[PDB]
Every structure is written in structure tokens, then in C-alpha cells.
Design a protein around this motif. Structure first.
Motif, PDB file in Angstrom:
ATOM      1  N   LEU A  26       1.095  -1.296  -0.174  1.00  0.00           N
ATOM      2  CA  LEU A  26       0.016   0.169   0.069  1.00  0.00           C
ATOM      3  C   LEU A  26       0.719   0.925  -0.235  1.00  0.00           C
ATOM      4  N   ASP A  27       1.592   1.388   1.073  1.00  0.00           N
ATOM      5  CA  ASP A  27       2.613   2.554   0.912  1.00  0.00           C
ATOM      6  C   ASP A  27       3.453   2.760  -0.554  1.00  0.00           C
ATOM      7  N   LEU A  30       0.700   3.758  -3.656  1.00  0.00           N
ATOM      8  CA  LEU A  30       0.439   4.869  -3.143  1.00  0.00           C
ATOM      9  C   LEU A  30       1.386   6.388  -3.690  1.00  0.00           C
ATOM     10  N   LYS A  31       2.843   5.963  -2.871  1.00  0.00           N
ATOM     11  CA  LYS A  31       4.062   7.111  -2.992  1.00  0.00           C
ATOM     12  C   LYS A  31       4.255   6.888  -5.000  1.00  0.00           C
ATOM     13  N   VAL A  33       2.073   6.951  -7.305  1.00  0.00           N
ATOM     14  CA  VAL A  33       1.036   7.391  -7.179  1.00  0.00           C
ATOM     15  C   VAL A  33       0.578   8.505  -6.554  1.00  0.00           C
ATOM     16  N   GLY A  34       1.127   9.819  -6.375  1.00  0.00           N
ATOM     17  CA  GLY A  34       1.636  10.804  -5.779  1.00  0.00           C
ATOM     18  C   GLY A  34       2.199  11.428  -7.021  1.00  0.00           C
ATOM     19  N   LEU A  38      -1.158  10.293 -10.465  1.00  0.00           N
ATOM     20  CA  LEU A  38      -2.474   9.324 -10.658  1.00  0.00           C
ATOM     21  C   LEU A  38      -3.721   9.580  -9.564  1.00  0.00           C
ATOM     22  N   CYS A  40      -5.800   7.311  -8.857  1.00  0.00           N
ATOM     23  CA  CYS A  40      -6.540   6.380  -8.389  1.00  0.00           C
ATOM     24  C   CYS A  40      -5.377   5.144  -8.638  1.00  0.00           C
ATOM     25  N   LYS A  41      -5.447   3.938  -7.487  1.00  0.00           N
ATOM     26  CA  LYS A  41      -4.733   2.713  -7.869  1.00  0.00           C
ATOM     27  C   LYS A  41      -5.190   1.804  -8.734  1.00  0.00           C
ATOM     28  N   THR A  63      14.651 -16.797 -24.348  1.00  0.00           N
ATOM     29  CA  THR A  63      14.361 -18.349 -23.768  1.00  0.00           C
ATOM     30  C   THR A  63      15.114 -19.128 -24.989  1.00  0.00           C
ATOM     31  N   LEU A  64      14.286 -19.034 -26.319  1.00  0.00           N
ATOM     32  CA  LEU A  64      14.831 -19.687 -27.268  1.00  0.00           C
ATOM     33  C   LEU A  64      16.728 -19.408 -28.334  1.00  0.00           C
ATOM     34  N   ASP A  65      16.711 -20.404 -28.651  1.00  0.00           N
ATOM     35  CA  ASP A  65      18.730 -20.992 -29.244  1.00  0.00           C
ATOM     36  C   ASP A  65      18.390 -18.896 -30.125  1.00  0.00           C
ATOM     37  N   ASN A  68      17.395 -18.721 -33.765  1.00  0.00           N
ATOM     38  CA  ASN A  68      16.040 -19.049 -34.684  1.00  0.00           C
ATOM     39  C   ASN A  68      15.198 -18.215 -35.468  1.00  0.00           C
TER      40      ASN A  68
ATOM     41  N   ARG E 117      19.582 -29.069 -30.552  1.00  0.00           N
ATOM     42  CA  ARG E 117      18.558 -27.972 -30.010  1.00  0.00           C
ATOM     43  C   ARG E 117      18.825 -26.737 -31.564  1.00  0.00           C
TER      44      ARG E 117
ATOM     45  N   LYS F  35      -8.542  10.405  -2.482  1.00  0.00           N
ATOM     46  CA  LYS F  35      -7.899   9.740  -2.963  1.00  0.00           C
ATOM     47  C   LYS F  35      -6.109  10.681  -2.451  1.00  0.00           C
ATOM     48  N   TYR F  39      -1.803   9.945   0.288  1.00  0.00           N
ATOM     49  CA  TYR F  39      -0.725  10.613  -0.147  1.00  0.00           C
ATOM     50  C   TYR F  39      -0.055  10.846   0.243  1.00  0.00           C
ATOM     51  N   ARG F  42       0.191  10.928   4.423  1.00  0.00           N
ATOM     52  CA  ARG F  42       0.938   9.621   5.216  1.00  0.00           C
ATOM     53  C   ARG F  42       2.012   9.398   5.401  1.00  0.00           C
ATOM     54  N   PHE F  43       3.085  10.423   4.341  1.00  0.00           N
ATOM     55  CA  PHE F  43       4.300  10.435   4.288  1.00  0.00           C
ATOM     56  C   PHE F  43       4.869  11.758   4.311  1.00  0.00           C
TER      57      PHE F  43
END
Lengths: 187, 142, 200, 138, 130, 60
Positions: A26-27, A30-31, A33-34, A38, A40-41, A63-65, A68, E117, F35, F39, F42-43
Motif C-alpha cells: 500500500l505504501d 501510493l508513493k 500514485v502521488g 495518478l 487511483c490504484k 529463452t529460445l536459441d 532461431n 536444439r 484519494k 498519500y 501518510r508520508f
RNA sequence: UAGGAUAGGGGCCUACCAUGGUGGUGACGGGUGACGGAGAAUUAGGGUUCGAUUCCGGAGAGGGAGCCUGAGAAACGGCUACCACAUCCAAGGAAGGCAGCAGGCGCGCAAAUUACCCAAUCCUGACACGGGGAGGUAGUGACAAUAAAUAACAAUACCGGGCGCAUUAGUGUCUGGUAAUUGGAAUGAGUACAAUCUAAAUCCCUUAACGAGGAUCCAUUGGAGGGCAAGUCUGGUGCCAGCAGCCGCGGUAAUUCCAGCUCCAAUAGCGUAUAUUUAAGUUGUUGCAGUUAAAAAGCUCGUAGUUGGACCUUGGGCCGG
């Protein structure tokens, strides 16, 4: 023939919490997002989904050769799609970094943060409003959408739009009423 | 001890596997047809009509009258008891109304502390149970 | 089929169903003849060419293998390359030499087989040349993923029950082999028509 | 482009143009910039326009299918200039014609239209006598 | 059975013992494992004793360890023959993470994972070298 | 045994508590806006942080 | 084997003829919202589950049988018959099948307008030119999903936590916010000339004139004992009332109740139920356990079935790139 409707398939993943409330998770979220601004999550979840799926494609080739036929041909597309956007910086073009990457690179290339970076806003919260206020645009045709996802090509072009103040002609409603009262009313 | 690894022997592993699933609750529900044996058809909710308000005493170290009501499903002859949650709500239910009931989250079965109460009340009189106790909404007349 | 092909030329906006007015005024001709039928069977090497102040076209393949226009010369439009799709054989000299669009052409060349190709004009349906199906010849693969590729015949393999595969040496990539029905020979040492980059 | 007033030009621009000798006409895209301004109009288009390509009539030419995008200052539609009034109608769908002024849209009633055809099949003879027949018969 | 697994199992328990070999009877798919060990240098020598007159064939091993680190950290079987579990050149499940190799009997013969391969030919895993 | 118990006692607690309607107080801005606040609270200068984090404490 | 039939081989049926066919590799029988498929959901993968659905192929069109016409129907918005239903009548007779589209009833947990058009998608017709509730069109529609409004920023005021300053007192500066105060800005939630657009209209689109002082243009649903993010709050209840999938709580100073406050936390979305996937290696192919926890058959012979050693024209040598 007559066509069918619309599927879609998941735009986002909220699958990522194993445990719905984690103090550490959560911490951290939110950082981000701040800083990028943004609201919202949900906006975090969609970009998280985009990161994971882009990375997933890359894993298969490497991962393949080496030499290829899928690896070489598709690898050209893989490199350039990120690079064009500005998601992947040059020098990081080892293909090791495409596997790695970060959430942060996507948010950094968005329009909203670019407004704040190039002065103007004096708050990332203010940067969110500014696009809605009709300010700033690549061409003439207003962006009010923070997640425009600038190419670096179109970064250069960012200056005020033709409408709204600082861009030119109209100031908008608040001044229009104030000046009307001032010149006939005395305020 | 170890499982057969063999080209033909695939068949042994397959046949045994199906039987094991019946121990697991989720598969057992479909396979035996225990869902049908439980009062609901398989439905999300089911509706009944209130026979009585019954005052069922709590089990073991809990002492209290839980206050339930027995409903007989419209679909079936099956009589079962459903809990009325919240302050009041014994008044809000009433005999002979249509009540919409759903499971506890126990997925059938009695809850435990209330003997033989397999369901709980989602709404009474079409209103919403939640609204009525809270005093957000009022029951319609008739 | 004709409706798709005509629409490819037209597509800017708002035609499509109004293709019908063009067709009925006979400002579309296909192989010098009137057809107004959307369900019309078409294949590779059909010529479209319309009256008077017109143009000439050859049907070619895109990456999928669907029909698309390329401009072709007026001289080439007079001629058409036609697969002998099926054959009625021999005696008294009455072949029905079927083509993909369904044209019949009649009577012996000093040869004739199934899977061989006949060079025809357009209007009168007389035999310009007859092209043998043999090794070293140039081919277009009509179907599958491999469509829009051209190559030279390495070998043909003949077997019991059918002749299963015919092998083509060239490709953007390397060799592939296909059924006889997929193979349409389009060039020979005797007469080629092939001077075209292609498809994918 | 687009003649000015004080209120800005609202650009008259053409693009993706083929003259197609089957449809016998000019098909092209009209991408109208509207910097700082609303709607160009169906009239204002075909009033400029006309004199560039030298069709010199609003009457034969139609513009349509405006939709747009968010952000403003541009709209995209499609418009055509036709070689003749008579020729145009045949190629055009009816929906263009009705708004242009070249055709009237006829409104019909489904129930009236279909049932009436069936009635015509049923009566054989003059059948005037049947009306009098029923009166007597009761 | 088929021996194969017995050699691999015996090898790792004998490493814990710190013995210089164990010596045992060998077969023909267990001729293969020893030669592959030589190539990837778990063995710098192998010798196939009494394969000439006797009832069986055999081979005493001279084996790496009795050094500092063990070279063969783990080898453990991943199914003998007589079964259908199959890989292709694209299917590749693996152990280790490229430090080891995955033992594969291919069309031409037994070769290591990278060789098979590259040639683009599948086969059936014999065991997992870590 | 007892399964035929009294129905008399329903709804005692609500009727022994006086009903209190909610109050008008300075409203936090809502939806997206609420919302935004979280942030920063709390920080930066934080809130409380006994154990994990805390908010509505009196006597501790 | 023969014949008749039908477009045709054909037990297809039917005569004569023989006495077979098929099964533990699960036949034969029963069940199944058991249509099949492409596909879907969900699983790292492997898989599991699902497939009513604008497609593809078949079946049926109230239930059943039988048949005409025609290239083609064992047609059902054809007939013919019976059965079952309902309809109409001047009661003698007669017409008819919404698992087509709207609409209505019943059913049930459950699902929308008796509007309009052949303009596009595509077909059919004697026919460019007509017709087509196919299809589009608008309404309704939180199955689902997408873009993302509900306010932002300065100043200023205390309050900080910084920082340079802080020597020495202090607070002070970028500002985090607690500020229904303030300050000019600005935008669309709204509104509306104009014309656009749709078959024609509405919408999308716009854009003149309009449109915020936070109480208004005001977001919500869940949660705060554990699981589970966030009180040992205040008042009240007191094994009562409820809460509680589960473990548990309530016997009078309950962080588990009931209200208020405050806080958390998703946010134009969230709860709840049932089914289902994961978790669940509780289905063990990948990837299980059986000394003592659930679990080696009393023992051996032994089949169907699985499984099964080695010699085995294989090994070696040379050059070229």
C-alpha cells in the motif's frame, strides 16, 4: 457477412495482491500514485498489466536459441516498439533491460508529468487540472487526457493550444463576467 | 509405491484419478448431485413463504435466542429455517410474506451455532432487509 | 469473386452496394464479356478491362492470398493464362478443357494433360500456345500460407494412389513442396509471363 | 484556403482524391480545420469549393459523414463533385439525394402496404354484386 | 529394467561417500551416459573393463572429485525407455538454468542439449545433469 | 430441548439507545479528490505510527 | 447370391442360402441444460472446466405420420390424416400454429419497443430502378468493457516537518495538509442560436450566448478482534438484541453488537449468492502419500495388459570449406 459484437479481454490486473491489505504494498503504490499524479490504484493496475504482458513476449524469444527464425525477426519489432515510444532508452538496448524494465518508465512518458517537468504547473495536482483547462497540446487539437503517452517525437511540439489563455484568444468565463461587471456596474 | 511410468499404463492413472475427486467437496457436489439434495435447485437465490417465526436457542457456551423463521420454498415442499439478522427484523419479516433467502457462505449445511438453520434472509417484502433495520427505507403497505 | 475486386478500386467511401448501377450499365466488363454476378468463380490470372476509356488489370495475390489489382499492359490483356483444371480425354478430338472460371476450350494440341496449362487469348477462345507441366518451370502457389511466392520446380514426386507432392526449390526462406492442385505453372522456358515481384 | 471574416477561416482542405472513370466522378475527403470555431456548415462548404473545382453549383454536390474526435479544431467528413446532375443520381445512394434536395423521402406504413396486395389477389370478378349479396343474405 | 537410472543414482550417493569409483555392470544406453560425461568433462578418462568373453559387460569408472569440488553436483534420472513423455526442440523443459545440460537421445544419436536444439531436432530426455 | 423460545425480546438494543442522526461537519472532497489527500497525509508529516500506523487514538 | 427401388453402391427392403457378427483395447445397456465444432473462462506452464448464442455443419419448428410441386423440401409463416390445443360462427360448418420480429400471459432467480427504413451489410425477383423486422435505425440494457468529470493553483493565516538561516532567540522557506474564509483564473456536469450528421431524425460533433466558492454543480458501496488495510473511541445494549463463510464474540467501563464520530480502503463503482478456475501436488502427466497420521490385497500361481539384456554394415581414417 453481417459482423459480430465485441469481446475485449482484460485491460488491467488487480490479481497482484495475494493478501488484500499489505502495509508494504500500500505504501509503495501510493508513493508512485502521488509522484506521477495518478488519482487511483486502478490507473496503477492498468499500467502494471501493460508492463507484464510486454515483458512476457520478450521472455519467449530470449529463452529460445540464438539465430532461431522467430527470435531474430520478431526481435526487430520487440526492440523498436519500446524505443519509438521512449519506454526503452538507447544504450539499454541489450535486450536484458527489456526483460527487466520498470513500471516507472511508462508513467514518465505520459503527458501529465511532462507538463510539470516543463515548469508551468507548480504541483503535479495542478498538472492534472492543466490539460482539462485546455492548456498544452502537440498540434491544435486539445488533449485533456493525462495518459496520452508521448513519443519523445511529440514532446518537442508541446506548447499551448490555440484556444484558452496563454494560447491566445479566449480567457474563459470567470474573467468574462468580471470585466462585464467592471465596465457597467463598477464591479 | 511410485506411480507407473509406461507407454500403455497411462490408462491406470486416468481411471483412478476420477474416484479421488469425489473426496474433494466441489466435485462431489456435482457428481453425487448433492446440490439437488440441498434445498436449492442450484439457484443463486430462492424464494419461500413464511410458515412461522421460531425462536431457536444457541448451541453450547453461547446462550441467546437467535430468532429465525421457517420458510417453505415455492419450488419445493421442503421446509427449512432461515436466520433473520439485525435488530428488529422479526417484526419486519411477518408470517405469509415472500422472503428471498440465500446461503450463509457455508455452501449448504447448517451454520453450526444455530442448529438446522441452513440459510439467511437477504430481503423481506421485496424491500431489502438492509434498508429496513437501518431505517433508510420503510416497508410498503400490503 | 468480382464484387470484392471492383470494390478494391472504388474504396474511398460510399460505393459498395451501389456497385450494381455500374454493372448494369456495363461499365465493368470481365474478360471482355458481361458478368454482373458477385458469386462468379475467379482465380489467378483473370483479366479485367472495361470499355473504351478504360484500364487493364491482372489478378494478383497479397500476403493472405486474396485477389488484388495490379495494372497490366493492353497487349497482355488480349492474352490470358489458364490452368487446365480438368480434362475430357482423347478420341475423336473432343476435349472439354476446363478452367478455374469455367471456360471450356475445344480440341487437340499434340499433348494435353491435367495440371498442364493452356495459353489462350481472351474473347474468341483460340489456342495461342500450350504449356507443358515439367521440371524447371516457374510456379505460383495458389493456397496455404505460402501463397504469393514464386519458385522453380526442383522435382516432381510420383507415387501410388496420387502423385502426392511436387517440390519447388525457391522461396523467401527455403524449399517447400505442395500438392498438384496448389501448383499453377505460370512460366516455362518456351513461354514465360513472369517478370513480377510477388506477394510477401 | 477558406475565406476569412474576423472569425477565423475554418480551412477548406481536400485530400485522398481519385477521379474514377466508372463512377464517373470525383471522390475526396474534406478535412476541415475549425481553429477556435464551431461547425463550418453544409452550405458554406459547397459555396466555396464549387468555384475551385469549377463545378459552379451547390445543387449537384453533397458533403456528409461528419463524426469527429475529441479535442476540437478539426472535423472529418467526405464530399464528392459529380460530372452531371443526371449521372450523379444513378451512382448515388438515396440518402444523399433526399437531404441534397434532389429527392423526397417517402414515408410508408408497413401494415397498410403489405395487406393491401393480398386483398387484390382474393377478389375475382367485379365483386360489387357481393356487397349487395351480403345485405340480402344477412 | 533398463540400467541407466541405476548408474546416475549410484554416482551421486558414491560422491557423498568420497569413493574413487564404485565399478559396475553396464549396458548399451549406459555406454552412452559415460561418453557424454567425458565430453562435458565429468570424466577425464573412462575404461570399459571385461567386455570380452564374460557374461556381461562392465566398466570401472575413474571419476572427477577427489580434487576440491565435485564436478557432478547432481545427476538424477528423468525417465527410462518404454514410456511416452516427449520433448521437441521448442518444447524444452530444463533443470539447472544453463550451467548443466539436459541429456537427450535425438534422431541421429545421443548428443547434448545445445547440439540437438541448433539442428532443430527433438527427442526424449534420459536424465538431468545439474 | 429449547427450540420453542420466546419471540418477545426482538429489537431491544436500538430502543434502549437514543437514536442520533449524523452531524454536518466540514466535508472532505470526495471520489478522486479524497484519494489525492491520502498519500500526502501518510508520508510527509505522517499521522501516528505506534505498531504500524494509527489514527483515532485517545488514551494509549 | 438374386432382385426391385432410388440419383447411386448399399440388408435398403424383400426371396433363397449359410450361420454368423461384436466384446475387458469396456463392447451391449443406462444416464446426461449431452447439439458437435471453430472457439470461451481460468490456469506461469501442464491442465481443468465450458461450448444457448449475429460464424460453421446438422436436427426440429405444437406432437407424430404421410405426401404434392419443383433443380432441390420427408417443408411446417404448405397440405393431408390422427392426437393434443386453442380460435370463430347466423352453430350448419370453417379457418390456424410467434423454439421468426415486436407485443402479452404463464413460468420461474432470470432477460427490453405492438416506432421506422431497404441508405450500408448481403440476397432474391420477369427486374439498373422493386421487395426483404435478414440487416441497419433509434429506444431500453452497470452481461461485460473503454475514455475519464465531481475541481485545481497561487496568496494568506495559524500548525508543522524541512532547508539555507538557526549564532541567540527563533520558527522560516520549498510547501504537506487542518483551514465551508480568501484571490483572480479555467473548464465541462449542465444549457443552447447555427448547421452537421442518421433511410429521415435523435446522439456522436460542436460552438456564439451561458454555466462552481466548496454547505454548492454535495459519490458511492463495503470494512475497522483475527483472517483483513483501519479505534482498546463516545453513548447505549448486556449470552438480550444482534455480529459471526471460518475461528469466535455479547453473562452491563464489548477496539467483534447498535448508533454517532473518526479512520481505512476500492472509487462510477462496490457488496451478496450459485456455478466454475486457481490456491489444491484435494487429483499428483508436469507433480503425491501408504512404519507409526487417511492408505499393500492372507498368500501364491497367473492371464488380458504393461514392461523387458547383449552380438546386431558398425566402427575408424583423409581431405575441402
Amino acid at each position: 457477412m453481417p459482423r459480430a459484437p465485441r469481446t475485449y479481454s482484460k485491460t488491467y490486473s488487480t490479481k497482484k495482491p495475494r493478501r488484500p491489505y499489505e502495509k508494504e504494498r500500500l505504501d509503495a503504490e501510493l508513493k508512485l500514485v502521488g509522484e506521477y499524479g495518478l488519482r487511483c490504484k486502478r490507473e496503477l493496475w492498468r499500467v502494471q498489466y501493460a508492463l507484464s504482458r510486454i515483458r512476457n513476449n520478450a521472455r519467449h524469444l530470449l529463452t529460445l536459441d540464438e539465430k532461431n527464425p522467430r527470435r531474430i525477426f520478431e526481435g526487430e519489432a520487440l526492440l523498436r516498439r519500446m524505443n519509438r515510444y521512449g519506454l526503452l532508452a538507447d544504450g539499454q538496448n541489450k535486450l536484458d533491460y527489456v526483460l527487466a524494465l520498470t513500471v516507472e518508465n511508462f508513467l514518465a512518458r505520459r503527458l501529465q508529468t511532462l507538463v510539470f517537468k516543463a515548469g508551468m504547473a507548480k504541483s503535479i495536482h495542478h498538472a492534472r487540472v492543466l490539460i482539462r483547462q485546455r492548456h498544452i497540446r502537440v498540434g491544435r487539437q486539445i488533449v485533456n487526457i493525462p495518459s496520452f503517452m508521448v513519443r519523445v517525437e511529440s514532446e518537442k511540439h508541446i506548447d499551448f493550444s490555440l484556444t484558452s489563455p496563454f494560447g491566445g484568444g479566449p480567457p474563459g468565463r470567470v474573467k468574462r463576467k468580471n470585466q462585464k461587471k467592471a465596465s457597467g456596474g463598477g464591479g | 509405491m511410485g506411480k507407473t511410468r509406461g507407454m500403455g499404463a497411462g490408462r491406470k492413472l486416468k481411471t483412478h484419478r476420477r474416484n479421488q475427486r469425489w473426496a474433494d467437496k466441489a466435485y462431489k457436489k456435482s457428481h453425487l448431485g448433492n446440490e439437488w439434495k440441498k434445498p436449492f435447485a442450484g439457484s443463486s437465490h430462492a424464494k419461500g413463504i413464511v410458515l412461522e417465526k421460531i425462536g431457536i436457542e444457541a448451541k453450547q457456551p453461547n446462550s441467546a435466542i437467535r430468532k429465525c423463521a421457517r420458510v417453505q420454498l415455492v419450488k419445493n415442499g421442503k421446509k427449512i429455517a432461515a436466520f433473520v439478522p439485525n435488530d428488529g427484523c422479526l417484526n419486519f419479516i411477518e408470517e405469509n410474506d415472500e422472503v428471498l433467502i440465500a446461503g450463509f457462505g457455508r455452501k449448504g449445511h447448517a451454520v453450526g451455532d444455530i442448529p438446522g438453520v441452513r440459510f439467511k434472509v437477504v430481503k423481506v417484502s421485496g424491500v431489502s432487509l438492509l434498508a429496513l433495520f437501518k431505517e433508510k427505507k420503510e416497508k410498503p403497505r400490503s | 469473386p468480382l464484387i470484392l475486386i471492383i470494390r478494391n478500386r472504388l474504396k474511398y467511401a460510399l460505393t459498395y452496394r451501389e456497385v450494381i448501377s455500374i454493372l448494369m450499365q456495363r461499365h465493368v466488363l470481365v474478360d471482355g464479356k458481361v458478368r454482373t454476378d458477385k458469386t462468379y468463380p475467379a482465380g489467378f490470372m483473370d483479366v479485367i478491362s472495361i470499355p473504351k476509356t478504360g484500364e487493364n488489370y491482372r489478378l494478383l495475390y497479397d500476403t493472405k492470398g486474396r485477389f488484388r489489382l495490379q495494372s497490366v499492359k493492353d497487349e497482355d490483356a488480349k492474352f490470358k493464362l489458364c490452368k487446365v483444371r480438368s480434362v475430357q480425354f482423347g478420341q475423336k478430338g473432343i476435349p472439354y478443357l476446363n478452367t478455374y472460371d469455367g471456360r471450356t476450350i475445344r480440341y487437340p494440341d499434340p499433348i494435353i494433360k491435367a495440371n498442364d496449362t493452356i495459353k489462350i487469348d481472351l474473347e474468341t477462345n483460340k489456342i495461342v500456345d500450350f504449356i507443358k507441366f515439367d521440371v524447371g518451370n516457374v510456379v505460383m502457389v495458389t493456397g496455404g500460407r505460402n501463397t504469393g511466392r514464386v519458385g522453380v520446380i526442383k522435382n516432381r514426386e510420383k507415387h501410388k494412389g496420387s502423385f502426392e507432392t511436387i517440390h519447388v526449390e525457391d522461396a523467401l526462406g527455403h524449399q517447400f513442396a505442395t500438392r498438384l492442385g496448389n501448383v499453377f505453372t505460370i512460366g516455362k522456358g518456351n513461354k514465360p509471363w513472369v517478370s513480377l515481384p510477388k506477394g510477401k | 484556403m477558406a475565406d476569412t471574416k474576423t472569425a477565423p477561416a475554418v480551412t477548406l482542405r481536400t485530400r485522398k482524391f481519385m477521379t474514377n472513370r466508372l463512377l464517373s466522378r470525383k471522390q475526396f475527403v474534406l478535412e476541415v480545420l475549425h481553429p477556435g470555431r464551431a461547425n463550418v456548415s453544409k452550405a458554406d462548404l459547397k459555396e466555396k469549393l464549387a468555384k475551385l473545382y469549377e463545378v459552379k453549383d451547390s445543387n449537384c454536390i453533397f458533403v456528409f459523414k461528419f463524426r469527429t474526435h475529441f479535442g476540437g479544431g478539426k472535423s472529418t467528413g467526405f464530399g464528392l463533385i459529380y460530372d452531371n446532375l443526371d449521372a450523379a443520381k444513378k451512382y448515388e445512394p438515396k440518402y444523399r439525394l433526399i437531404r441534397n434536395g434532389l429527392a423526397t423521402k417517402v414515408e410508408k406504413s408497413r401494415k397498410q402496404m403489405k395487406e393491401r396486395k393480398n386483398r387484390a389477389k382474393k377478389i375475382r370478378g367485379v365483386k360489387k354484386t357481393k356487397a349487395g349479396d351480403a345485405g340480402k343474405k344477412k | 529394467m533398463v540400467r541407466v537410472s541405476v548408474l546416475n543414482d549410484a554416482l551421486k550417493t558414491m560422491y557423498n561417500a568420497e569413493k574413487r569409483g564404485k565399478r559396475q555392470v553396464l549396458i548399451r544406453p549406459s555406454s552412452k551416459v559415460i561418453i557424454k560425461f567425458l565430453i562435458v568433462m565429468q570424466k577425464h578418462g573412462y575404461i570399459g573393463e571385461f567386455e570380452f568373453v564374460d557374461d556381461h559387460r562392465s566398466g570401472k569408472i575413474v571419476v572427477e572429485l577427489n580434487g576440491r569440488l565435485n564436478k557432478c553436483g547432481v545427476i538424477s534420472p528423468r525417465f527410462d525407455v518404454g514410456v511416452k513423455e516427449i520433448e521437441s526442440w521448442t518444447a524444452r523443459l530444463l533443470p539447472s538454468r544453463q550451467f548443466g545440460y539436459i541429456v537427450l537421445t535425438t534422431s541421429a544419436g545421443i548428443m547434448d542439449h545445445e547440439e540437438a536444439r541448433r539442428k532443430n531436432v527433438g527427442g526424449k530426455v534420459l536424465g538431468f545433469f545439474y | 430441548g429449547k427450540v420453542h423460545g420466546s419471540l418477545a425480546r426482538a429489537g431491544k438494543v436500538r430502543g434502549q439507545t437514543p437514536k442520533v442522526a449524523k452531524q454536518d461537519k466540514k466535508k472532505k472532497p470526495r471520489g478522486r479528490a479524497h484519494k489525492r489527500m491520502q498519500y500526502n497525509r501518510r508520508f510527509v508529516t505522517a499521522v501516528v505510527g505506534f505498531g504500524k500506523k494509527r489514527g483515532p487514538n485517545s488514551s494509549e
